[PDB]
Design a protein around this ligand. Structure first.
Ligand SMILES: [Cl-]
Ligand SMILES: [Cl-]
Ligand SMILES: [Cl-]
Ligand SMILES: [Cl-]
Ligand SMILES: [Cl-]
Ligand SMILES: [Cl-]
Ligand SMILES: [Cl-]
Ligand SMILES: [Cl-]
Ligand SMILES: [Cl-]
Ligand SMILES: [Cl-]
Ligand SMILES: [Cl-]
Ligand SMILES: [Cl-]
Ligand SMILES: [Mg+2]
Ligand SMILES: [Mg+2]
Ligand SMILES: [Mg+2]
Ligand SMILES: [Mg+2]
Lengths: 258, 258, 258, 258
């Protein structure tokens, strides 16, 4: 039995170069979806048809991607908003400049907002489709050292997503959130290695430092990119037709409240 | 590609006679699981090996089922606690007798507690497994007319489940909650028909009365039993290995908060 | 200016022998309220008129207190449900017996339920009054070692309280929850001292052990009994006439989610 | 007994011209605080020393107010961030322009962020003080017609506030949120009257239309400006010394979840 498939579905998945983005692109293709993804620069190995080059942190980039989506897919059945991250330095709330706030909002909130504004009305007119906003456990569990503005932007995204669900769910478009905790990437593995040029070393000890900083991960490990992809594919499928306006956390139990 | 399967997995699914319980039993069997389910009386059509007869609202019934599980399955990889419901009359909090409170707790909370106490330690010793507590959106969104004690019992279940996840997730047993809104069953369809011997009639109008009572369902319809089964099977599978200590709501958007 | 007073108000405050219970009794008397409080045995120093002797963990005790309230106060304007606690040993969920579950529910949930059932309808008939359910941060942030059933019972209480608020708030009775974190009592100070007959000693070090177990208290200290009383008196006063159906946390920031 | 006072305390209360802002200014002055408040233009009746003229929706305005605070108060013990509102038209998420998003963020989020960045470090250096972020129930309960961006901005504010509390609470500065539902103002009373030039008329009927739009208010009426002021004064006082990192909702029970 083929429990789940995405055959025929046209999907825009933002930021599919690496990490969970790449894993989600890869899984969607496995499941039969036609995929368009985005990056500032196309990675050398993958088909030109799969990528549109753009800076989604700018309104010009969003305009380009929305149009490319229309031209390449002809329409969208699934949007997965994966673009996100934080580049702010540490030092707490008072070390955040106007630039930092603008950067955090542009990356984590505005790309989804701008793309949705362009693409969702057509989905509503058709009367079917799914939008997945990838938020972050920091939206409920903020970590202040360098991610105060990151957390705030993800909280804006989460509530924006719920608001949109209230509007478009009655019209047949589902809108869900996926909220990951720590995801194991090349970047994070190197971060774990880094925290070992400082006191300690062992890598495992480095990962422990990171996990303790989150308040501990009951599962004892971060999520793999493929595991985030798994949840997103499930939510985008017809096996999830009654799921909308909800946030599905994938964090190994990190968020410690019920 | 076979995205999801449950081959080899041994599953206890409580209360599998009808509704979402029956749909979950049916889906698990489709996906290759060995299933044991429970009811006060076996339905006439289905194999004797599939059912254990017991009253899970009593501690004797729970003792019987735990032992039957050991004898028939030899061990458990997945427990899905589906037993739940409310038999209290209306009249608000002051119309709830001591019997009503006892009944609501015994049905919605104590069966899971008693079974988990017996079965989960062996899963922990093996170092693998999944427990699914089926709660209810009323645990966060209580409706006072007849379901004040029902809501309270489901809230106890939800927090109990989270507590257990904190303890056993580090030992390799995942513990998740599935929180349904209104599920379309034979009982509810007849309820919709009933609210038409009162003012109105149209059935569709009857379902509207029910949905308005919930504060509205953005999706515009209740969940189907098969849709609840879909989510439970996903959570029980290895595609969900990083998901624990979380509650996954399936309610068409009913809960109106982010 | 006398910002706040409780002159003329008749208050039942359960479990007022010590800790926050005693501090709340004391503050209410300071603010002009007529108070009735409860204990298994009256403390030697305080007026007989102030206390009714009863075991509120039994339905007989609740019946006695409700009647004593009617006889001594003639009516109730404010009920503060402070009775709560946990006597379960450690060992996690599987070490909880049927007795443990019964004890936790009887102490933390059933006394409020039984008393409310008797007393609240008269408040509703008058069309004014306040009920304060003292819950616990464990209702959202459960700690599994010895307090799995305690957390579950407090979650039941919290959702029960919200359900009741939906019913009686439109009739002019406010129903609010106060959710304390760690409260500094004689018992807890001795617990801090105890964890020093084990590794360490310093008392301050003992309090650190406790706080770390909670995941840390940002404020850096537990709440004082008087501080819990402060919040309860505010909520019971006419300065809080628009506050109902809400839970007010007093925990020095312990709960780490927004 | 003088339960509560704010004598000696120096308070910046933003946006104190009308509504809850004016009521909070008035109450703080009653309780002995030295107050500085803000508006685009000073209302004709009140002392020049009480107001600084500025447009807090701009970074220049925030710079002006922070400096005026330093000159007029010499230091700040309490900041109450009351500035907020929405000017977006209806039409749902797709009717929100880039200007709308910028306006909603600048008004509801950025004024607090910019002021806090300037003023909070000095409070931290002193080791005492309170910051109150006035959010909105829409941060959890978003209403999509015209307030999608408003809700998102208030959610950003709420999580930002929690993040800051984690950082500065250990240093002796408390950071709390007050989350109002509908507040009765001149503007809203006229809105109620307006919805009567449309179908209906009765004013009471107009207020019913508004309340139904919120999903109903169990209390049956909006909060008064003075009632919001009451809660803010309590939270700013030494009677609330153990309350930090929490959000206190004042909405007559509107938010329907526990
Ligand atoms: Cl990677
Ligand atoms: Cl496939
Ligand atoms: Cl929704
Ligand atoms: Cl059925
Ligand atoms: Cl299969
Ligand atoms: Cl967990
Ligand atoms: Cl004490
Ligand atoms: Cl007084
Ligand atoms: Cl309520
Ligand atoms: Cl006004
Ligand atoms: Cl005063
Ligand atoms: Cl905090
Ligand atoms: Mg910076
Ligand atoms: Mg009854
Ligand atoms: Mg025990
Ligand atoms: Mg607009």
């Amino acid at each position: 039995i083929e429990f789940l498939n995405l055959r025929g579905k046209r999907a825009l998945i933002t930021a599919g170069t690496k990490g969970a983005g790449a894993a989600t692109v890869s899984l969607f293709l496995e499941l039969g979806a036609q995929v368009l993804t985005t990056a500032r620069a196309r990675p050398e190995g993958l088909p030109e048809e799969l990528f549109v080059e753009a800076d989604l942190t700018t309104k010009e980039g969003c305009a380009i991607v929305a149009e490319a989506t229309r031209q390449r897919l002809g329409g969208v059945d699934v949007i997965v908003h994966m673009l996100g991250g934080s580049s702010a330095a540490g030092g707490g709330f008072s070390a955040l400049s106007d630039d930092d706030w603008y950067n955090e909002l542009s990356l984590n909130l505005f790309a989804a907002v701008r793309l949705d504004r362009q693409l969702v009305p057509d989905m509503v007119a058709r009367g079917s489709g799914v939008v997945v906003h990838v938020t972050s456990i920091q939206r409920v569990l903020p970590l202040p050292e360098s991610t105060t503005a990151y957390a705030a932007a993800k909280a804006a995204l989460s509530t924006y997503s719920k608001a949109m669900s209230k509007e478009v769910s009655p019209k047949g478009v589902r809108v869900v959130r996926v909220s990951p905790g720590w995801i194991e990437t090349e970047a994070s593995v190197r971060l774990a290695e880094r925290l070992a040029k400082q006191a300690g070393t062992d890598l495992e000890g480095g990962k422990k430092i990171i996990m303790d900083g989150l308040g501990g991960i009951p599962l004892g490990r971060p999520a793999k990119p493929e595991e985030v992809a798994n949840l997103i594919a499930f939510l985008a499928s017809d096996r999830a037709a009654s799921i909308t306006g909800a946030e599905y956390t994938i964090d190994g139990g990190t968020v410690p409240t019920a």
